[model samples]
Target chain A: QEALGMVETKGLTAAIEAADAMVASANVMLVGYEKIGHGLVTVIVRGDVGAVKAATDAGAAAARNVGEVKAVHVIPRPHTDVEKILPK
Target chain B: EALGMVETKGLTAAIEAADAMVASANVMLVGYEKIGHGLVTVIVRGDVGAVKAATDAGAAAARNVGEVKAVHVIPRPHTDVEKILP
Candidate 1:
């Protein structure tokens, strides 16, 4: 799974449209709201670093496809789970 | 979301299997990591009070189900974005 973001000043309808573009290219999982009123989306698909690179590029392309949107932000860091602090 | 712990003494396969159980129940999302030779899995789901209760129950169940390691109640307060937003 990968976490990504898209920023827009328009509205949710436009944001959902932009997100739909990403879903078309890859497998979309969950989408949520961030503090910025932007959308944070997760996608899972095949490929390595190169695939991640391409996926991010596609995400940016999707943002660009929507005129009023600012840009797509893809966090390179993997999601860190807080479960490591347990005793064994 | 609730935070639950299910300890297994076996290995990663056991850890993954237990995690699958948590997911299937929609109890919470499990985050796994290695600690020593065993694995530590953190489950995130449910509301605050219910999750706390689930954590206590899960720890006991894990002890009965496998080698009892250690159980803890780590409460992570929710981040209120509105308060932080300026």
Candidate 2:
């Protein structure tokens, strides 16, 4: 269905800022957020493939300005199993 | 509330630590955190003394079974920490 965008950052503040910028930059919905200890946080969003790509780019850029941006990715069609594990 | 954390390299070790922590002191097992790559952390909460006792017991037990990465006791965690932890 929709593509998924993920932005992993070193702190919660950066992740939140990235999520905000991502949704504002494209037609994307904030899907979920995950806290992987050692100060790592990840923000997730879903939208059309092009929108997801745009959102991830914006998220990474925004996160880098606030904190360490670990990674950014866009999955055009995430596997069903992946969707099941992610927060609704 | 005081907080206790036991980080282990494997799930089995984490479970072992959680059991020991609960059995050693009057602490409550709050939740478990998995931070990918086989790292698992068991969280417990109770009085400061009890939490310290629980974390010590947990670390000892987990070290016996598997790799014990770290053990920490926080008398009082920052309120903002609740945002990240369950």
On TM-score, the leading prediction is 2
Mind giving the per-residue lDDT tens digits that candidate 1 earns over B1-86?
Answer: 43344444544443543444454354565454333344444434556565566655655556555654433332442232112111
TM-score of 2: 0.53
Q: Pick the candidate with the highest lDDT.
A: 2
DockQ of 1: 0.01
What is the model-wide C-alpha lDDT for candidate 2? 0.78
Off by over 4 Å in 2: A1-88
Question: Candidate 1 at residue A46, lDDT?
Answer: 26
Clash pairs for candidate 1: B1-B45, B2-B45, B2-B46
Q: What fraction of the genuine interface contacts, i.e. the true contacts, does candidate 2 reproduce?
A: 0.04
Residue-level lDDT of model 2, residues B22-76, one tens digit each, is 9954799988877665667788889999999899999899999898766766576
